[PDB]
Design a protein around this ligand. Structure first.
Ligand SMILES: Nc1nc2c(ncn2[C@@H]2O[C@H](COP(=O)(O)OP(=O)(O)OP(=O)(O)O)[C@@H](O)[C@H]2O)c(=O)[nH]1
Ligand SMILES: Nc1nc2c(ncn2[C@@H]2O[C@H](COP(=O)(O)OP(=O)(O)O)[C@@H](O)[C@H]2O)c(=O)[nH]1
Ligand SMILES: Nc1nc2c(ncn2[C@@H]2O[C@H](COP(=O)(O)OP(=O)(O)O)[C@@H](O)[C@H]2O)c(=O)[nH]1
Lengths: 6, 48, 440, 427, 372, 426
């Protein structure tokens, strides 16, 4: 779950 | 030792291998059903 | 038409706040992704779920919950799990680091970045919903994230919204055990800035629930799947007369007039009577006039204090289930003839009940058995006054020579609030002593 | 001709006052669907009292359904007879019924009082002669004892001659489920003893204890007490819609009852109540009901008779009986109790015999007392106020909503005029 | 729990619009409830109600709730569809020319088997509809006697809905030939009743698919159905019987035995009526005279009637005084041989509703199947 | 009955029209082999606007596709839609224009218009009654701004009655992709005002915003920014092509919007934009569409509308709808933000209603608008020009192909006096 995970 | 897992109820030696038909049904007694509201105050009628 | 809005801030609130929505989805028919099973239809008449759910255009039911924490570890714990489909993906606001027990962080440095965005969700839901009745925040007094950051969310609604009562719930910072060192420093901090902007602030002590699990239950060594499932029962029965119809139903606007006598006595307790497993309730009987007496047991309170040294001020015995309203006045006068249960003299009546026509329920997998009745008693007592004598005593002994103060002063904090807040919890104790002191 | 306009305010009277519309509509024979469903012909030709008609000849009631929150208008649209009311004069509201007198009057009551008078007018200006206002309220909260005052103080400026007979539940002597009570109730008795011309009383405690002693019930719910009150109010409004031999309207009851202007709170009742097992071992005469009228344990009030010398007992009989048996047995109970009737009134009692029995029993009646024992209900609630005022214990909300401190002295001072002006004629 | 839901349909009298609601019934506690599918707000709130029964929860059977009459039209649910409609199947039967004087014991056997009788009506079919019954049959045997019995003797068509109706009808019927059934000597409707094998019996379909063909042959859509199956007059056209609710009670077979007793014939039965207009049309003589008229039209509002034309047979006992006095308790005071003392179930609303004046029987019968 | 002649030029145009001509294939149920396999019958009703008839039930468009180099229409035939575009309607050159105006306007694109005008005048007289024209072309390049402005010039010389519309790809003002943008875009807007009535200005800097913050795609191409431009093209003619509650054609919004001969520079938009992952949490209703298209972050040119006052604002709608609820929403956006309109027109908003929403939508709308804050789309080009005219930065290209400097000098006296009309009213 980095930047822009979902 | 209570460790039948972290979250478990410690069951006794005889109570563990016996029958366990207790988790299903309800627990409390009842609310007792009396006679109806208007049966005592007002009945039916019949002419003959 | 009778909706309420919930936020969950900090790990101790969002993880109870996990356990709030197991129970709510199972009271109604919603399968946990948000879609109805559709093998069974429901008639178009009922509007029960609108207290906590808002169904979309097609078929999905959407909650009222803004799960915010400035950490990723507990939100992405839910966002990848088995409950990820329920919420709005723009509701799940997160950030960069925890407040890490720094009120100088959660209110001054890091907490002020997302605070212009997290109010935009509380503004969004309440724009769409009209008959709003209150707030259900879930926090804790202890850490700097659940207590430093909720006070920012507490004062921005008071300037913006105002007249709506604001019903937060919290975990009390305990007498006996703890899991920090700056918690006596921290719990005094939320009192100074929220007390002028709050109309209700409940509390629960967590290690009493440890010992309820040993006596009423048979649970030795309880985890936190277990304590947060007892918190869920209490909140779902305070919030049951708005989504279910009963004999004696109370809106959330009477919960502030009848329960807050003076403008600084609004911190009451809670308890729940039939926490019984299957191996004992199969042997017990549980009628109405004998679950009400169990509510006054010192072995049934959710907060370790002494009710025998506390003169009860304003009980409010909320019931559920298959109960009949003669039996309460059989039970209530039985309680008020008892010699040990001391009340307040100058309060003439000091009682309230609520009877509803919906039973208690159990999330499957837990310990609990099928109980026909449930009492959720909110006890406004005198007994919690001496639990303020310990935490102020827990504050000042490191404040004799100012321990851990140099971590606060890094992130834009002065010492000056610490001295100004200690008389503020000394002004709070002098009013709990005078109410039990009778007028001769 | 002869009519009564109706409203239903508060939660307590909304359930009871809509339990009224079945004890009416089964005697007269109306189906829930609005069609006539009667057995006999005699109970159709005085239907213009409570009911306005509808096109096609179906029948709708005169009622007004207004309370602060839409919770209970979804409870009185209910199963038995919800279809009959007019859907236009249903009134709801938005803000909470938070038991505050400014929520009764100043804050929430202001927006409705323009609309909720025009529901009295639209059912009264289309009439010939107005005779009664029947309002089912309570005396506990700002829901029912802030709206019960509001919907009658406005009216008295424009409908001043006629009679306004409400029906109100008084607080119980043991435990009340509201804690905020005498800020409103003593502020509502300032208008109810002034504006109204008759105003009833009902305990909740005595309503339970009839069910255990005489009825020998096991489990009295809240569905039972509705019936026990709805039958009394539907028996005292029968000489105005039945044939009879000694007939009195609601303004006969203005000159019969009250001797001094501010003493008009009466004590209801109903005579032939019994159990199931003891029916075959009970006989029905005019002397055998008369004991059960004058039974100390058949009233709706907890006050013992020893404090009470009755002023004007009016037992309205209903059945096929004898007019001498009525008159000899409404006097043979009086010489036997000399000290418990006043010496400055020579005939202390009054009857009324009618022609149509209730549905179910061949003969019944309705006691209505007027006692000097009701100071015990007066000494209770005036004593709750004095300790709570000096604390200003809950006055933060009413002052926050806008009720000044100098008016709570005045309301108890004028509630003190309901014992002081009572004590002159006690002796 | 375990509610069963249905879609209901009521004709509003003042503004004449057909109205659709959703009713809910809760087995095991007696509750009902009613929302509106047309407008989503709740008009009727939840209530308890005692007279409704799980056997009355069948699609089509018209049941009164709170003095409103409604027919259950749809299945709004997959749960109740699975719970009931997978089991409740329909079977077709027909009383042939020989079974009219022996129908009581067969109908009692059907009521002991527990099939619900929807429509059981005498019929005299037209030429094409009569030939469509015999179009399917072809084999070696000569069926001249059976064909003349079908084209000459009057018959009745009936529908029985039951759980595994075809299987229970086959197990009650048994063997096909009369001599073979008597040689097998089991208790059966074919062994005890029926004449000469294929000459006459109560009709039974071979398969569930062929039951549609048999039902379409005997009772098709009402184009050439034939309104009458009996003579309009026989100089004594003066006895009308009707059974609105005792058919739901189930004593129709026993009262057929008691009317077969003492040598009284039965002419024509049918089971179609509108609840109000048709009854009003012939309760017109009754309109001015009778008291408790509301009740005497309400227990005909309640259910369908197997209403039956009958003639005077012997003058020794009049059929009206066999029917009895107007009250069952007065009947039990006077004589147990009265049909109210045997069967009457309401205070004035007797089990068999008749005519009082002997003149109007012919006109009532001509109304009841010649016009209708 | 009222067909549309479509024009294309450049390689900037022919990636857009290749994406324009597939949503028309989507909405009319046209498969990429020329036939029709849609399940409706109203889609086959007015098929003739974009689909000429042939043998075998084939439906092939009224399409013109032009460039000066063969290197682009090889790829248009090699796309997903090869069999539909007409082989006689690929007019081609040999030498690319190469970011210069007179390479297409005076020399190499000028010798080739006599083969384009053969195609059009044959085709446009095969229509029983044409409604007008449309163009999507590059102001940034050398072929669209060079050659295509002749086709706006010379075809209008033939028929002055019809309507000229332009899906102009105007350059961004911030990040530039060519060093002669303040010449090819400056000189092209010298001839747009005497010649063209509808002018839709489109920026890619304005559209790199929308496919990130609103559709939530981290890797956007042109082909997923071309579709929103291809959304608003078929989002204009929604009412001529289908029945409904209030139909409107392309003369009906060229009368409600442009009160003057020279104030006609529109501002495009599109209403219902939400992420791909979160599509089923929104409620696609009437208040959701209007709350987006009245904002600055749903705008297809890169000028903030808040710095000026709209003179006139158009709209169009689609889908089954309740017309009073829009009527409540259009007065609210005229009563609340009354400072964002001029006070000297009574009514500023027009609406028009179709009946069938697109395949996969329920409620659709498209935003077209006149606005006087389009000056910042033109003053940045007009201040780029004189910062290089004064240094004579590239004039040897332009003089050595058949131009002057008096064809340069007057092309900002038009561009200044254009803004010297918009300035007074805001
Ligand atoms: N009820 C409940 N309380 C918990 C749980 N986990 C931790 N706590 C309590 O939370 C207290 C710390 O308060 P918090 O402010 O929530 O901790 P924190 O600062 O939010 O930690 P971060 O989420 O990393 O910022 C501890 O003293 C625990 O008693 C839990 O699962 N349930
Ligand atoms: N008959 C009847 N009485 C009720 C019911 N529910 C509540 N009550 C009475 O209403 C009282 C509540 O106090 P009340 O004056 O109504 O509070 P308020 O509604 O805020 O004015 C209780 O003491 C009950 O006696 C009901 O369902 N039926
Ligand atoms: N969004 C988008 N922009 C495009 C597309 N095609 C070209 N452009 C822009 O067009 C400009 C280049 O045009 P150009 O090729 O020189 O025009 P031409 O020489 O006449 O074909 C560049 O600034 C691109 O950003 C497209 O399909 N989508």
């Amino acid at each position: 779950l980095l930047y822009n995970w979902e | 030792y209570p460790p039948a897992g972290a979250e478990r109820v410690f069951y006794g030696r005889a109570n563990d291998p016996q029958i366990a038909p207790s988790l299903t049904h309800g627990i409390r007694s009842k609310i007792s059903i009396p006679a109806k509201v208007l049966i005592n105050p007002q009945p039916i009628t019949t002419f003959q | 038409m009778r909706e309420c809005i919930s936020v969950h801030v900090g790990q101790a609130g969002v993880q109870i706040g996990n356990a709030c929505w197991e129970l709510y989805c199972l009271e109604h028919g919603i399968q946990p992704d948000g879609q109805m099973p559709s093998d069974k239809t429901i008639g178009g008449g009922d509007d029960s779920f609108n207290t906590f759910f808002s169904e979309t255009g097609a078929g999905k039911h959407v909650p009222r919950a803004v799960f915010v924490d400035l950490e990723p570890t507990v939100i992405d714990e839910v966002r990848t799990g088995t409950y990820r489909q329920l919420f709005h993906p723009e509701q799940l606001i997160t950030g960069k680091e925890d407040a890490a027990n720094n009120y100088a962080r959660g209110h001054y440095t890091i907490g002020k970045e997302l605070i212009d965005l997290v109010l935009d969700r509380i503004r969004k839901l309440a724009d769409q919903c009209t008959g709003l009745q209150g707030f259900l925040i879930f926090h804790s007094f202890g850490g700097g994230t659940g207590s430093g950051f909720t006070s920012l969310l507490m004062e921005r609604l008071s300037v913006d919204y105002g007249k709506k009562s604001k019903l937060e719930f919290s975990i009390y910072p305990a007498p006996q055990v703890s899991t920090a060192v700056v918690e006596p420093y921290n719990s005094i901090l939320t009192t100074h800035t929220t007390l002028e902007h709050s109309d209700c602030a409940f509390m629960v002590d967590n290690e009493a629930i440890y010992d309820i699990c040993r006596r009423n239950l048979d649970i030795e060594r309880p985890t936190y799947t277990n304590l947060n499932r007892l918190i869920g029962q209490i909140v779902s029965s305070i919030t049951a007369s708005l989504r279910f119809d009963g004999a004696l139903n109370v809106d959330l606007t009477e919960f502030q007039t009848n329960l807050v006598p003076y403008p600084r006595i609004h911190f009451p307790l809670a308890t729940y009577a039939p926490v019984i497993s299957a191996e004992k309730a199969y042997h017990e009987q549980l009628s109405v006039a004998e679950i009400t007496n169990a509510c006054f047991e010192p072995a049934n309170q959710m907060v370790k204090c002494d009710p025998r040294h506390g003169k009860y001020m304003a009980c409010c015995l909320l019931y559920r289930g298959d109960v009949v309203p003669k039996d309460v006045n059989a039970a209530i006068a039985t309680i008020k003839t008892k010699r040990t249960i001391q009340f307040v003299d100058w309060c003439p009546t000091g009682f309230k009940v609520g009877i509803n026509y919906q039973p208690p329920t159990v999330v499957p997998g837990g310990d609990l058995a099928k109980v026909q009745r449930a009492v959720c008693m909110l006890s406004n007592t005198t007994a919690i006054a001496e639990a303020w004598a310990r935490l102020d005593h827990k504050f000042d002994l490191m404040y004799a020579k100012r321990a851990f103060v140099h971590w606060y002063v890094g992130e834009g904090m002065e010492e000056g609030e610490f001295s100004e807040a200690r008389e503020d919890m000394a002004a709070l104790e002098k009013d709990y002593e005078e109410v039990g002191m009778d007028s001769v | 001709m002869r009519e009564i306009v109706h409203l239903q305010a508060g939660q307590c009277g909304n359930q009871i006052g809509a339990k009224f519309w079945e004890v009416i509509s089964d005697e007269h024979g109306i189906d829930p669907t609005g069609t006539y469903h009667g057995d006999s012909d005699l109970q159709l030709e005085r239907i213009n009292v409570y009911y306005n008609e509808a096109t096609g000849g179906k029948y709708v009631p005169r009622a007004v359904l207004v309370d602060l929150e839409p919770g209970t208008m979804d409870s009185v649209r209910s199963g038995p007879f919800g279809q009959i009311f007019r859907p236009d004069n249903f009134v709801f509201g938005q803000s909470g019924a938070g038991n505050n007198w400014a929520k009764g009057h100043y804050t929430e009551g202001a927006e409705l009082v323009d609309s909720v008078l025009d529901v009295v007018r639209k059912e009264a200006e289309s009439c010939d002669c107005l005779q009664g206002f029947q309002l089912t309220h309570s005396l506990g909260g700002g829901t029912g004892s802030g709206m019960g005052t509001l919907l009658i103080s406005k009216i008295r400026e424009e409908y001043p001659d006629r009679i306004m007979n409400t029906f109100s539940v008084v607080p119980s002597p043991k435990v009340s489920d509201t804690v905020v009570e005498p800020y409103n109730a003593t502020l509502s008795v300032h208008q109810l003893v002034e504006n109204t011309d008759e105003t009833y009383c009902i305990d909740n405690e005595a309503l339970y204890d009839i069910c255990f002693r005489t009825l020998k019930l096991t489990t009295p719910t809240y569905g039972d007490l509705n019936h026990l009150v709805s039958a009394t109010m539907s028996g005292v409004t029968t000489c105005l819609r039945f044939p009879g031999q000694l007939n009195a309207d609601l303004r006969k009851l203005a000159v019969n009852m009250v001797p001094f202007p501010r003493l008009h709170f009466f004590m209801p009742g109903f005579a032939p109540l019994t159990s199931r097992g003891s029916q075959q071992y009970r006989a029905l005469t005019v002397p055998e009901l008369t004991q059960q009228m004058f039974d100390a344990k058949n009233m709706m009030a907890a006050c013992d008779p020893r404090h009470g010398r009755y002023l004007t007992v009016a037992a309205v009989f209903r059945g096929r009986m004898s007019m001498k048996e009525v008159d000899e047995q409404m006097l043979n109970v009086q010489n036997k109790n000399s000290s418990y009737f006043v010496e400055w009134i020579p005939n202390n009692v009054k009857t009324a015999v009618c022609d149509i029995p209730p549905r179910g029993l061949k003969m019944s009646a309705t006691f209505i007392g007027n006692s000097t024992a009701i100071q015990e209900l007066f000494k209770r609630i005036s004593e709750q106020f004095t300790a709570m005022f000096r604390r200003k214990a809950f006055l933060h909300w009413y002052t926050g909503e806008g009720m000044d401190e100098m008016e709570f002295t005045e309301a108890e001072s004028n509630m003190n005029d309901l014992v002081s002006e009572y004590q002159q004629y006690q002796d | 729990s375990e509610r069963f839901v249905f879609i209901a349909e009521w004709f509003d009298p003042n503004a004449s619009l057909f109205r659709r609601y959703e009713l809910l019934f809760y087995p095991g506690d007696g509750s009902v409830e009613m929302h509106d599918v047309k407008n989503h707000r709740t008009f009727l709130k939840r209530t308890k109600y005692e007279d409704l029964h799980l056997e009355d929860l069948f699609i089509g059977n018209k049941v009164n709730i709170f003095s409103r009459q409604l027919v259950l039209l749809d299945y709004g649910d997959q749960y109740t569809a699975r719970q009931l409609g997978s089991k409740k199947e329909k079977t077709l039967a027909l009383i042939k020319p020989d079974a009219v004087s022996k129908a009581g014991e067969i109908i009692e056997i059907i009521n002991k088997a527990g099939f619900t009788l929807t429509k059981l009506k005498m019929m005299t079919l037209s030429r094409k509809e009569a030939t469509d019954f015999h179009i399917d049959h072809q084999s070696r045997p000569f069926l001249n006697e059976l064909i003349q019995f079908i084209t000459s003797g009057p018959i009745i068509a009936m529908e029985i809905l039951r759980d595994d109706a075809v299987c229970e009808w086959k197990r009650l019927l048994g063997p096909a030939n009369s001599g073979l059934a008597r040689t097998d000597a089991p208790e059966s409707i074919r062994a005890l009743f029926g004449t000469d094998g294929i000459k006459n019996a109560a009709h039974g379909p071979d398969s569930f698919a062929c039951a549609a063909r048999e039902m379409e042959l005997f009772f098709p859509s009402s184009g050439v159905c034939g309104p009458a199956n009996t003579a309009k007059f026989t100089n004594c056209t003066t006895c009308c019987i009707v059974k609105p609710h005792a058919v739901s009670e189930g004593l129709l077979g026993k009262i057929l035995m008691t009317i077969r007793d003492a040598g009284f014939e039965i002419s024509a039965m049918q089971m179609f009526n509108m609840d109000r207009i048709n009854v009003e049309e012939f309760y017109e003589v009754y309109k001015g005279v009778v008291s408790e008229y509301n009740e005497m039209v309400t227990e005909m509002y309640s259910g369908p009637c197997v209403a039956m034309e009958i003639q005077q047979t012997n003058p020794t006992m009049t059929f009206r005084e066999f029917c009895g006095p107007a009250d069952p308790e007065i009947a039990r005071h006077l004589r147990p041989g009265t049909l109210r003392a045997i069967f009457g179930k309401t205070k004035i609303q007797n089990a068999v509703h008749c005519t009082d004046l002997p003149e109007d029987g012919l006109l009532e019968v001509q109304y009841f199947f010649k016009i209708l």
